[PDB]
Curated annotation (Swiss-Prot), chain A:
It comes from the Eukaryota. The gene is tubgcp3. Belongs to the TUBGCP family. Interacts with gamma-tubulin. It is found in: Cytoplasm, Cytoskeleton, Microtubule organizing center, Centrosome. This is Gamma-tubulin complex component 3 homolog. Necessary for the recruitment of gamma-tubulin to the centrosome and for the formation of a functional centrosome.
From Swiss-Prot, chain B:
Belongs to the MOZART1 family. It comes from Xenopus laevis. This is Mitotic-spindle organizing protein 1. The lineage of its organism: Eukaryota, Metazoa, Chordata, Craniata, Vertebrata. It comes from the Eukaryota. Its main location: cytoplasm.
Swiss-Prot record, chain F:
GO terms for biological process: gamma-tubulin complex localization; microtubule nucleation by interphase microtubule organizing center; mitotic spindle assembly. Belongs to the MOZART1 family. It comes from the Eukaryota. It is found in: Cytoplasm, Cytoskeleton, Microtubule organizing center, Centrosome; Cytoplasm, Cytoskeleton, Spindle. Keywords: Cytoplasm, Cytoskeleton. Required for gamma-tubulin complex recruitment to the centrosome. Part of the gamma-tubulin complex. The chain holds residues 7 to 65 of 72 of the full protein. The lineage of its organism: Eukaryota, Metazoa, Chordata, Craniata, Vertebrata. This is Mitotic-spindle organizing protein 1.
Length: 109, 59, 51, 49, 51, 59, 56
């Protein structure tokens, strides 16, 4: 798990193989804290929130598509951690809308 | 190896549609950590700080 | 949600205070370092016997 | 010449500290050690030469 | 918002430790001085290996 | 160019006044320059309120 | 009084499929009678159960 999270840090930054030590140290801290997620396990409940999110960015065709993909996903492998992956993706979603500001001058402040 | 690869490929289909915006390699790590027990909320949070940190750095 | 804020805040203070003290106990002097200063004074006296 | 030089460094055995061919050395014992203030003076045995 | 709140709590404590950690290294002890006690020791052994 | 920026300022300035502000024209100019340069709108709003409050305690 | 109450509380926990020990509930009566906020009492114990999980 030490290796996996360190490799996680190195990969995202696209470089730094022992220079991402500081970011790593933080990540070890956040993970070491605890959470109580609103909605805990149960596959139906997470699928329902994902569909609402799809409709909201106006990607209807995608909402219908995903549902087949969910049944398929299950069939390919069955976990007790299935829900944690689907909720993880959910939170980590990105909106298409707006520019995500500058980073080419926002760095400096 | 056969079983594992086939969930990931189905998993990468969802990720590109839902607009995760993560890479393939990184996702496999996210999934291994879950199966070993991680909280989802913490895991997204870490991803987010790392992501923002990379963009600023490049420019 | 408020429960989360209540549990977590206390945890962060406890962890953070652990680290700082552990940093302070190590930096203030290890016994090992002190012993070389004692040795150096004994060495200085024998040197003053060669002059 | 070896015997003469060896004797001379110790000044006919009148030195125990350092070898010198200077005849300008001050003959003095050292101040009490710091390991000799924690337990009092102790005579060094010349073991393992 | 609650999740944004958590990113800020934990990250601030991590910053605090880094700042404290360096400040504490410098003024609680000098690494410079201690290296110099060990050096003088070494210089004096070498002096005595030349008689 | 000089004319165009003035009009851009001018319209914003009219809106700030309707909504009631304590900022002058000079400060308002600075804010826009920050907006263009990135900077989510909530961080800017907060730093202003804390700085406005501290000035009253002092004076 | 503490014991009599612990048995009825023990019945309730078993229904919820929530594991608590005999001992925890009895200590709980002691804390209540001294005054404890309902949020606090729950929060110390919830964490203490998770600590026990990680530990072994």
């Amino acid at each position: 798990p030490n290796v996996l999270l360190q490799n996680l840090c190195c990969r995202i930054l696209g470089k730094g193989e022992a220079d991402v030590a500081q970011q790593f140290q933080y990540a070890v801290r956040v993970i070491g804290s605890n959470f109580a997620p609103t909605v805990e396990r149960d596959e139906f409940l997470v699928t329902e929130k994902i569909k609402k999110e799809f409709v909201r960015q106006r990607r209807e065709a995608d909402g219908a598509l995903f549902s087949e993909l969910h049944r398929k996903l299950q069939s390919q492998g069955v976990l007790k951690n299935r829900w944690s992956i689907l909720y993880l993706l959910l939170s980590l979603s990105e909106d298409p809308r707006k520019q995500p500001n500058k980073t080419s001058s926002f760095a400096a402040l | 190896m056969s079983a594992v690869r086939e969930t990931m490929d189905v998993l990468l289909e969802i990720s590109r549609l839902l607009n995760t915006g993560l890479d393939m390699e990184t996702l496999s790590i996210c999934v291994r950590l879950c199966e070993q027990g991680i909280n989802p909320e913490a895991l997204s949070s870490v991803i987010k700080e790392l992501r923002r940190a990379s963009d600023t750095l490049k420019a | 949600d408020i429960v989360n804020l209540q549990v977590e805040m206390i945890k962060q203070f406890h962890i953070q205070s652990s680290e700082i003290q552990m940093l302070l106990e190590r930096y203030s002097l290890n016994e090992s370092l002190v012993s070389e200063i004692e040795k150096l004074r004994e060495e200085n006296k024998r040197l003053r016997a060669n002059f | 010449d070896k015997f003469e030089k060896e004797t001379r460094g110790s000044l006919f055995g009148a030195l125990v500290h350092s070898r010198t061919n200077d005849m300008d050395i001050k003959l003095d014992m050292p101040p009490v050690p710091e390991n000799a203030d924690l337990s009092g003076l102790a005579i060094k045995v010349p073991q393992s030469i």
